[PDB]
Amino acid sequence: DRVADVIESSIGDSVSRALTHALPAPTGQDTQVSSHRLDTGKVPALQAAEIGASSNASDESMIETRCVLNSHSTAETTLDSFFSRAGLVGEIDLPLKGTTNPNGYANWDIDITGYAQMRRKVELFTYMRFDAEFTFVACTPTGEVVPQLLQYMFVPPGAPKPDSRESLAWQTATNPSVFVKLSDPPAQVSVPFMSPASAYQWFYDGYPTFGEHKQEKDLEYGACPNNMMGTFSVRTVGTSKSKYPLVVRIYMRMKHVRAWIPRPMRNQNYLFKANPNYAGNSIKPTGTSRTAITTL
Amino acid sequence: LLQYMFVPPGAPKPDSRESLAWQTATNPSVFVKLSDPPAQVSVPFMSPA
Amino acid sequence: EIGASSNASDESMIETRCVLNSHSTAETTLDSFFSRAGLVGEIDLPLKGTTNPNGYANWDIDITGYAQMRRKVELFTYMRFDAEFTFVACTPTGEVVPQ
Amino acid sequence: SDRVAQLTIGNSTITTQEAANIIVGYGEWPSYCSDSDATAVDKPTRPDVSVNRFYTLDTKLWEKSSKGWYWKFPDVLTETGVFGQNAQFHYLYRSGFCIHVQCNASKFHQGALLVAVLPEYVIGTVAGGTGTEDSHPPYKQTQPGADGFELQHPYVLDAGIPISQLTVCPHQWINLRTNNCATIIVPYINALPFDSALNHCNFGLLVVPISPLDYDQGATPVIPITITLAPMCSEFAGLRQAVTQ
Amino acid sequence: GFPTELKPGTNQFLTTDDGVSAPILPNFHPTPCIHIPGEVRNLLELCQVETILEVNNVPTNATSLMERLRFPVSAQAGKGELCAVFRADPGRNGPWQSTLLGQLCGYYTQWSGSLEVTFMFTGSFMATGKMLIAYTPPGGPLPKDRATAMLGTHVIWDFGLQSSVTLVIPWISNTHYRAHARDGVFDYYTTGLVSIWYQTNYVVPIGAPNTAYIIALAAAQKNFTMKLCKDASDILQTGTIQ
Amino acid sequence: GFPTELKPGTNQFLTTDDGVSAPILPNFHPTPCIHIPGEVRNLLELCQVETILEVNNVPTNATSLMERLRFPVSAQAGKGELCAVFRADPGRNGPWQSTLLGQLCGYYTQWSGSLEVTFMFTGSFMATGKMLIAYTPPGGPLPKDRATAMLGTHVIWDFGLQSSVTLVIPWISNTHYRAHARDGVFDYYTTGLVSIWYQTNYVVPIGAPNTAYIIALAAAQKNFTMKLCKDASDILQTGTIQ
Amino acid sequence: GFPTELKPGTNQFLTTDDGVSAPILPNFHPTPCIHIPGEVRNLLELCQV
Amino acid sequence: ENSNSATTINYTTINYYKDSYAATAGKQSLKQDPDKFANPVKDIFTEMAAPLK
Amino acid sequence: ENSNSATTINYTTINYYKDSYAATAGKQSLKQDPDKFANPVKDIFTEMAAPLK
Ligand SMILES: CCCCCCCCCCCCC/C=C\[C@H](O)[C@H](N)CO
């Protein structure tokens, strides 16, 4: 390197320059004693919101305050305190006579977007990285517990999915499987982080395949292959048909949680899984309304 | 099979057996059978005073 | 024609960059590959039938009865291991009964 | 001091005399990928001055009844100059950005704009109006190109989320009373070290008039809005043929 | 073996319980984590960010939904007229439901701390005026005129080069924490009212518009905390999500 | 006795669980282990061994099954004609299913690393020629001619005393790992294409055969790894094994 | 696992038993206690009035 | 044990197996960086002084 | 305990009985010998040099 453009160059600097840093903060900030002020040139109240930053005025600048020692804890607003609570994420029905799953087996694609209460919580951020904990509660349509043997198999993507109650894929020589009774307490296991990326993403702005994107290939927009973790399969262990109808409910609880890049929370009703679609005719405001702005 | 849910003030109370509030994504809940020994839990001091 | 594999590397053929690889090789060991339970046998005890109608049965210990584990074990010629057998019992329909 | 500014990168320069400081998104500057993060083996190319310079896309007119517009990045620059040629010749892409929005008026005009950057801005449909039809937006709406696209329901941001919470994203205001420009600097935002520039869009730029434009009859009625941007710390890898689609 | 005994808490499934479970994939190592910008460690960081406050939540038509984001100001007769009023409860229904702070506090029963409201003037450069923004602590009725409204904590705002002013709603309460307030017994937890009055007038020269608009932004201070996590009052699902 | 409690995971049988069980034969000592040659400790050692790649998987008759192991080369008109094309995904259906690397990767969902392909020329000693073997990274269509194929990573192979050449398929991907690719959404994980073109010609003197054959051998490099063990897609049993 | 045995006292609910139970609200911190006059520690103080 | 957890936080976990992703949630570290979103400006300004002049 | 296991690997087992073949699988040692199958040749040759000359 001889020319004095390469020596002085900043190309190749891989270190991130951070303007800010994190500080310990176990409790809320205290309030100190302040008195009256009568001066020119110091205006804590006057701000400029066009800059794009929040107001830096404090309690002591605007009014006269007293000394208060704040010991309120901030430990309930962390991510593990907010997300490590189990919620319903799926439901599987195994009826005797019906059209959905009459043959005694069912397949469920692993997804979180099926129910609104957990979907709205998880869609506050763009990227998320966590471990899981799945609990399976099984019973009859009326809630009664009956003697029966069940099998749950986890099928990673690419593995052959069972096609019948007596399929050869139920030998589970490689895939993990669980044998449990309906008289036992609900089964629960642990799940790692399996994404090929560094974090799950709930919003993907793009197409997964190359080539022209026509109108008959529009169902591929927004589909991220890195979130497709496989299939959950269930059957009644036997050769003949079972005697009772069954219902299975799945609850999942996160742990070891990290999150990035917050975004506005959902405003309208949900319509489809993995789709931000909303009802065009009925758009409702975020909150309530009143008759006049000058009254209550 | 029974379910007990603890509803803190301000939270929406269920209005039917199939209410959407039974998803218990935030409120603590307990699933227990009648053949099990009685369920029991611990409760802190929650008063604003 | 020598009978050995190619010794060429990435750096010899193309221009490369410095990459630090931290991917683990702990999932391809033999204990990580074989310590997963699989079906190896099945015994039927019917009320009326021709196979085992008298209430007892005998099964010769073998692994070659089912293809999924047989194909895995027949990748090598010699194998030395401990075992762990689990017996799941139920009725033909899956119901559990006192017996 | 904070009102006058100059931005120099490459062979282009921008001068302004009415500014409101520079926002550095998420408190981080653009930088190159480190050896620990990198996964591909081939060495990337860094053309430097030929791709990191200011580009101007188009001019849009502000009316008394405007709704808003949005652009997709880096979809705007995939057809412009050496950056476009490099992006459509290689497979992998990474870079930061610097965004400058300009809009000027007189001392008798009034109005306000919100300029925000939202990563992974997925667009939804009105679902036929009743929520019964599972439709998807056409390719024109998802990636409009360098001409942009106009919002239909700015209140829900065309995606079902409120606009009143868009300030959580890196943003500025253009108040015709105070300033006439907005500058935002964005690092590379993704869950992967490299990605395709023809299949993935990193973020989107939103310009929505919160307070409507007004003026008395006799003043100039044409109030244009112009967008200028410049890549920062661009990297390419995976050389092959040139594909446009 | 070792003699043990079972206590009256076995065989139950508590959703908030934190324990150990058997892993399904042994010796599995996850993908390395690269640096991603914008990591959030606590929700109070998001609670300290300003968002638009819909003080003018009168209109409801689809075409007029964007008109809820600002409220007007214009020339008056000089009597000290009233402009707008709203409540100071972030968790209650009303203007605060449009902010991120209100949405985040909707998940928590109790809160404590000071709030902050910022008003930005979006008129022409040739317009002038002064305003009085007053906060009335709990127990006092809605002020009838400006003379009664001046008796609480207030600030006087003068339009000029700096287009924004900030009003701080200090923490004045008898209890350490407040629960979510509503009509009935739970109106024991009201925070008060905020009113905006004309100080002098809205003066404008010849050739400039007679009406301007104000944008209100709201956030929290550094002593704000919440506790006793619960579920949101509104669920965004009307049937089966297909 | 000691008070305990039971948690919602009892009485289940997880097949991948690793625990303790009661021995059936106490004080039993197994046979001593003598030295046996050829012990394998890890599967990557087998993944680094070359095996024949069936590029020419056209014929299916029983008599013609041995013809899938090689593809021909002969004299052309000198325009730079095309010889053969195939994909670079070891886990996908196609040529790679005949190698040991493909069979071993069939048990794992994700993989990462560089690959290696070796071509051996089995013509006469009096034959000469040159060839171009090109690798096209993902996103590019099948090259129409040699001019477009030269723009990717390639090598030019000259027949001589050394009958073999090696082409290295470097790791070029956006994610750290790839999942198994197939038509549809999962074609997000394609690795690219490999093409073989005539450089100059296949020149042969009087009295030597006009057609020769090429054998392709494939293996992996030293950075190849897999994870997330699963089951093979194909089961070799059509009924009850009697 | 670890071999154990169950003794003839399991599955009962003794009201005067003192033991541990699973908390329902994790990481919850109660309100601080201010000084209040007139705290009673034992009932004999009231028995002496 | 294998160090295969998803996680400067989460330091007080309890485990019974050899895989780190089966442990308890534990307690995290109480640190905040409000200025990342509240004050992402390039040139910081004092509260007393006028922001724009 | 009796040392009657089937096994330079498998060193971190857990046991509750006196027979070593009832313990857990544990963790093995990460060692590889690719040259046993890849390069079983008698006279090793350098990559740069021509293999046969
Ligand atoms: C007997 C074992 C049954 C296993 C049950 C399923 C376990 C597999 C869970 C995979 C990881 C869960 C998280 C999945 C990914 C994202 O959350 C969703 N794709 C979002 O749509």
Ligand SMILES: CCCCCCCCCCCCC/C=C\[C@H](O)[C@H](N)CO
């Ligand atoms: C109540 C105890 C029942 C015991 C069940 C059977 C245990 C005996 C197992 C013997 C060892 C198993 C492995 C057998 C040998 C080879 O695997 C097979 N012969 C292969 O065909």
